[PDB]
Amino acid sequence: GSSGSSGKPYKCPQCSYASAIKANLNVHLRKHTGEK
Ligand SMILES: [Zn+2]
């Protein structure tokens, strides 16, 4: 079942978001833990 994007080591605990840099992921979450 085609799903998620494999590659980068750092993966998001929420979505299938993966990044090569840690700091990058950190900011990515800043949005996950926030909504209107
Ligand atoms: Zn995410």
Swiss-Prot record:
Which residue stretches are annotated zinc finger (C2H2-type)? 10-32
Tissue specificity, in the record's words, reads: Isoform 1 is strongly expressed in placenta, spleen, kidney, testis and peripheral blood leukocytes. Expressed in CD4+ and CD8+ T-cells, CD19+ B-cells and CB14+ monocytes. Isoform 3 is strongly expressed in placenta, ovary, tonsil, CD19+ B-cells and CD14+ monocytes.
Localization (cell): Nucleus; Cytoplasm, Cytosol
- Disulphide connectivity of cysteines: none
* Annotated residues for binding of Zn(2+) 2: 12, 15, 28, 32
- Protein function: May be involved in transcriptional regulation. Overexpression causes down-regulation of a number of genes involved in the immune response. Some genes are also up-regulated.
Can you say what this protein is called?
Zinc finger protein ZFAT
Shown stretch of the complete protein: 297 to 325 of 1243
